[PDB]
PDB file of C-alpha atoms and ligand atoms in Angstrom:
ATOM      1  CA  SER D   1     -15.182  35.753 206.731  1.00  0.00           C
ATOM      2  CA  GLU D   2     -12.292  34.338 208.777  1.00  0.00           C
ATOM      3  CA  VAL D   3      -8.715  33.142 208.262  1.00  0.00           C
ATOM      4  CA  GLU D   4      -8.520  30.236 205.882  1.00  0.00           C
ATOM      5  CA  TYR D   5      -6.047  28.515 203.591  1.00  0.00           C
ATOM      6  CA  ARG D   6      -7.162  27.508 200.113  1.00  0.00           C
ATOM      7  CA  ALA D   7      -6.310  25.021 197.369  1.00  0.00           C
ATOM      8  CA  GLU D   8      -7.826  23.467 194.272  1.00  0.00           C
ATOM      9  CA  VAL D   9      -8.043  19.691 193.857  1.00  0.00           C
ATOM     10  CA  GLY D  10      -4.674  18.425 192.650  1.00  0.00           C
ATOM     11  CA  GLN D  11      -2.628  21.296 194.116  1.00  0.00           C
ATOM     12  CA  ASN D  12      -0.524  21.249 197.261  1.00  0.00           C
ATOM     13  CA  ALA D  13      -2.024  22.829 200.367  1.00  0.00           C
ATOM     14  CA  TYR D  14       0.165  24.962 202.628  1.00  0.00           C
ATOM     15  CA  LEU D  15      -0.677  25.390 206.307  1.00  0.00           C
ATOM     16  CA  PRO D  16       1.631  27.643 208.351  1.00  0.00           C
ATOM     17  CA  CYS D  17       2.996  26.827 211.791  1.00  0.00           C
ATOM     18  CA  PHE D  18       6.054  28.258 213.540  1.00  0.00           C
ATOM     19  CA  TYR D  19       7.883  28.391 216.838  1.00  0.00           C
ATOM     20  CA  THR D  20      11.172  29.834 218.023  1.00  0.00           C
ATOM     21  CA  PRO D  21      13.568  27.286 219.559  1.00  0.00           C
ATOM     22  CA  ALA D  22      15.552  28.218 222.644  1.00  0.00           C
ATOM     23  CA  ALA D  23      18.838  27.703 220.764  1.00  0.00           C
ATOM     24  CA  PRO D  24      19.669  26.129 217.385  1.00  0.00           C
ATOM     25  CA  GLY D  25      19.330  22.358 217.308  1.00  0.00           C
ATOM     26  CA  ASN D  26      17.321  22.479 220.559  1.00  0.00           C
ATOM     27  CA  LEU D  27      13.993  21.482 219.054  1.00  0.00           C
ATOM     28  CA  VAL D  28      10.536  21.108 220.580  1.00  0.00           C
ATOM     29  CA  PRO D  29       8.304  18.167 219.548  1.00  0.00           C
ATOM     30  CA  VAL D  30       5.387  19.039 217.269  1.00  0.00           C
ATOM     31  CA  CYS D  31       2.062  17.264 216.633  1.00  0.00           C
ATOM     32  CA  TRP D  32       0.105  17.792 213.400  1.00  0.00           C
ATOM     33  CA  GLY D  33      -3.333  16.228 213.044  1.00  0.00           C
ATOM     34  CA  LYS D  34      -6.662  16.608 211.284  1.00  0.00           C
ATOM     35  CA  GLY D  35      -9.310  18.126 213.519  1.00  0.00           C
ATOM     36  CA  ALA D  36      -9.187  20.955 216.034  1.00  0.00           C
ATOM     37  CA  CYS D  37      -6.653  21.008 218.866  1.00  0.00           C
ATOM     38  CA  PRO D  38      -9.299  20.355 221.604  1.00  0.00           C
ATOM     39  CA  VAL D  39      -9.499  16.791 220.224  1.00  0.00           C
ATOM     40  CA  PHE D  40      -7.091  14.372 221.932  1.00  0.00           C
ATOM     41  CA  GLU D  41      -3.524  15.664 221.458  1.00  0.00           C
ATOM     42  CA  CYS D  42      -3.654  17.312 218.028  1.00  0.00           C
ATOM     43  CA  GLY D  43      -6.654  15.586 216.444  1.00  0.00           C
ATOM     44  CA  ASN D  44      -6.137  12.573 214.177  1.00  0.00           C
ATOM     45  CA  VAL D  45      -2.360  12.497 213.947  1.00  0.00           C
ATOM     46  CA  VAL D  46      -0.732  12.854 210.529  1.00  0.00           C
ATOM     47  CA  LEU D  47       2.848  13.957 211.387  1.00  0.00           C
ATOM     48  CA  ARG D  48       5.097  14.267 214.451  1.00  0.00           C
ATOM     49  CA  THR D  49       8.599  15.481 215.299  1.00  0.00           C
ATOM     50  CA  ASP D  50      10.597  15.131 218.490  1.00  0.00           C
ATOM     51  CA  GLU D  51      13.690  16.901 219.838  1.00  0.00           C
ATOM     52  CA  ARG D  52      15.871  15.460 217.052  1.00  0.00           C
ATOM     53  CA  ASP D  53      13.964  14.451 213.909  1.00  0.00           C
ATOM     54  CA  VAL D  54      10.677  13.623 212.247  1.00  0.00           C
ATOM     55  CA  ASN D  55       9.446  10.493 213.993  1.00  0.00           C
ATOM     56  CA  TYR D  56       6.034   9.967 212.322  1.00  0.00           C
ATOM     57  CA  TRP D  57       4.401  10.798 209.014  1.00  0.00           C
ATOM     58  CA  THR D  58       1.473   9.844 206.786  1.00  0.00           C
ATOM     59  CA  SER D  59       1.647   9.623 202.996  1.00  0.00           C
ATOM     60  CA  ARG D  60       1.131  13.054 201.325  1.00  0.00           C
ATOM     61  CA  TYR D  61       1.916  15.097 204.487  1.00  0.00           C
ATOM     62  CA  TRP D  62       5.250  16.931 204.599  1.00  0.00           C
ATOM     63  CA  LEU D  63       7.424  19.304 206.587  1.00  0.00           C
ATOM     64  CA  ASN D  64       9.382  20.829 203.699  1.00  0.00           C
ATOM     65  CA  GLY D  65      10.381  23.995 205.555  1.00  0.00           C
ATOM     66  CA  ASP D  66      13.381  24.449 207.830  1.00  0.00           C
ATOM     67  CA  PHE D  67      11.922  22.617 210.800  1.00  0.00           C
ATOM     68  CA  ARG D  68      15.253  22.614 212.643  1.00  0.00           C
ATOM     69  CA  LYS D  69      14.808  26.404 212.846  1.00  0.00           C
ATOM     70  CA  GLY D  70      11.155  26.199 213.911  1.00  0.00           C
ATOM     71  CA  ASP D  71       9.343  26.325 210.551  1.00  0.00           C
ATOM     72  CA  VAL D  72       7.020  23.374 211.020  1.00  0.00           C
ATOM     73  CA  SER D  73       4.597  24.446 208.300  1.00  0.00           C
ATOM     74  CA  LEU D  74       2.675  21.605 206.673  1.00  0.00           C
ATOM     75  CA  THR D  75       2.465  20.694 202.999  1.00  0.00           C
ATOM     76  CA  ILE D  76      -0.363  18.373 201.917  1.00  0.00           C
ATOM     77  CA  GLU D  77       0.355  17.068 198.435  1.00  0.00           C
ATOM     78  CA  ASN D  78      -2.217  16.319 195.731  1.00  0.00           C
ATOM     79  CA  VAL D  79      -5.215  17.431 197.774  1.00  0.00           C
ATOM     80  CA  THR D  80      -8.748  16.128 197.277  1.00  0.00           C
ATOM     81  CA  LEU D  81     -12.023  17.527 198.575  1.00  0.00           C
ATOM     82  CA  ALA D  82     -11.800  15.121 201.539  1.00  0.00           C
ATOM     83  CA  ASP D  83      -8.773  17.086 202.790  1.00  0.00           C
ATOM     84  CA  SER D  84     -10.900  20.139 203.688  1.00  0.00           C
ATOM     85  CA  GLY D  85     -11.327  20.940 207.355  1.00  0.00           C
ATOM     86  CA  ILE D  86      -9.570  22.132 210.504  1.00  0.00           C
ATOM     87  CA  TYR D  87      -6.004  21.000 211.236  1.00  0.00           C
ATOM     88  CA  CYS D  88      -4.126  21.234 214.540  1.00  0.00           C
ATOM     89  CA  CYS D  89      -0.456  22.206 214.813  1.00  0.00           C
ATOM     90  CA  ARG D  90       0.567  21.726 218.451  1.00  0.00           C
ATOM     91  CA  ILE D  91       3.949  22.986 219.686  1.00  0.00           C
ATOM     92  CA  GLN D  92       4.693  20.691 222.644  1.00  0.00           C
ATOM     93  CA  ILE D  93       6.832  23.012 224.749  1.00  0.00           C
ATOM     94  CA  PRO D  94       8.314  21.082 227.703  1.00  0.00           C
ATOM     95  CA  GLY D  95       6.280  21.653 230.831  1.00  0.00           C
ATOM     96  CA  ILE D  96       2.640  21.576 231.862  1.00  0.00           C
ATOM     97  CA  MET D  97      -0.263  23.615 230.416  1.00  0.00           C
ATOM     98  CA  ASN D  98       2.069  25.610 228.183  1.00  0.00           C
ATOM     99  CA  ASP D  99       1.640  24.141 224.690  1.00  0.00           C
ATOM    100  CA  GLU D 100       1.015  26.404 221.716  1.00  0.00           C
ATOM    101  CA  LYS D 101      -2.031  25.281 219.738  1.00  0.00           C
ATOM    102  CA  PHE D 102      -2.779  26.530 216.230  1.00  0.00           C
ATOM    103  CA  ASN D 103      -5.998  25.665 214.394  1.00  0.00           C
ATOM    104  CA  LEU D 104      -5.789  26.071 210.606  1.00  0.00           C
ATOM    105  CA  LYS D 105      -8.843  25.915 208.346  1.00  0.00           C
ATOM    106  CA  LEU D 106      -8.240  24.385 204.908  1.00  0.00           C
ATOM    107  CA  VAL D 107     -10.804  24.943 202.129  1.00  0.00           C
ATOM    108  CA  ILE D 108     -10.517  22.809 198.966  1.00  0.00           C
ATOM    109  CA  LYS D 109     -12.533  23.392 195.782  1.00  0.00           C
TER     110      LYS D 109
HETATM  111  C1  LIG R   1       8.638   8.089 200.915  1.00  0.00           C
HETATM  112  C2  LIG R   1       8.105   9.219 201.792  1.00  0.00           C
HETATM  113  N1  LIG R   1       8.905   9.930 202.776  1.00  0.00           N
HETATM  114  C3  LIG R   1       8.026  10.817 203.316  1.00  0.00           C
HETATM  115  C4  LIG R   1       8.171  11.845 204.307  1.00  0.00           C
HETATM  116  C5  LIG R   1       9.399  12.173 204.887  1.00  0.00           C
HETATM  117  C6  LIG R   1       9.486  13.200 205.826  1.00  0.00           C
HETATM  118  C7  LIG R   1      10.842  13.558 206.435  1.00  0.00           C
HETATM  119  C8  LIG R   1      11.449  12.756 207.238  1.00  0.00           C
HETATM  120  C9  LIG R   1      12.810  13.149 207.809  1.00  0.00           C
HETATM  121  N2  LIG R   1      13.352  14.264 207.472  1.00  0.00           N
HETATM  122  C10 LIG R   1      12.674  15.187 206.533  1.00  0.00           C
HETATM  123  C11 LIG R   1      11.500  14.851 206.037  1.00  0.00           C
HETATM  124  C12 LIG R   1      10.822  15.814 205.066  1.00  0.00           C
HETATM  125  C13 LIG R   1       8.297  13.865 206.119  1.00  0.00           C
HETATM  126 CL1  LIG R   1       8.320  15.189 207.283  1.00  0.00          CL
HETATM  127  C14 LIG R   1       7.091  13.564 205.549  1.00  0.00           C
HETATM  128  C15 LIG R   1       6.998  12.563 204.632  1.00  0.00           C
HETATM  129  N3  LIG R   1       5.750  12.271 204.043  1.00  0.00           N
HETATM  130  C16 LIG R   1       5.701  11.386 202.996  1.00  0.00           C
HETATM  131  O1  LIG R   1       4.530  11.224 202.274  1.00  0.00           O
HETATM  132  N4  LIG R   1       6.853  10.616 202.670  1.00  0.00           N
HETATM  133  N5  LIG R   1       6.822   9.691 201.769  1.00  0.00           N
HETATM  134 CA1  LIG R   2       3.817  21.386 227.374  1.00  0.00          CA
END
């Protein structure tokens, strides 16, 4: 088939996303959203970070990894079938036409 991430209703879903900062504590803002990265900025936004901290989140969506070291992987808690679909993790590297865009397909059953 093709790369996908899987969960059963009631479980947590785990969607990977990583970048390497230039030096520790020098973070890059990240945009997580539902929908593919060609849509707006990172789809329908569910979570954002900036250079210093998490600045936006939606209930059930988490960065539980070490995001100050570039692990910006997403946890979606207590998934339902409506959570299936493509998600966008966008690494907003400073500068123009240089973002890293990751599209992650989540399948719930
Ligand atoms: C009461 C509550 N708080 C959060 C929350 C907090 C954070 C967060 C903020 C700053 N530093 C580390 C973290 C993990 C994130 Cl990323 C996601 C979150 N999502 C969520 O459903 N809730 N709910
Ligand atoms: Ca950029």
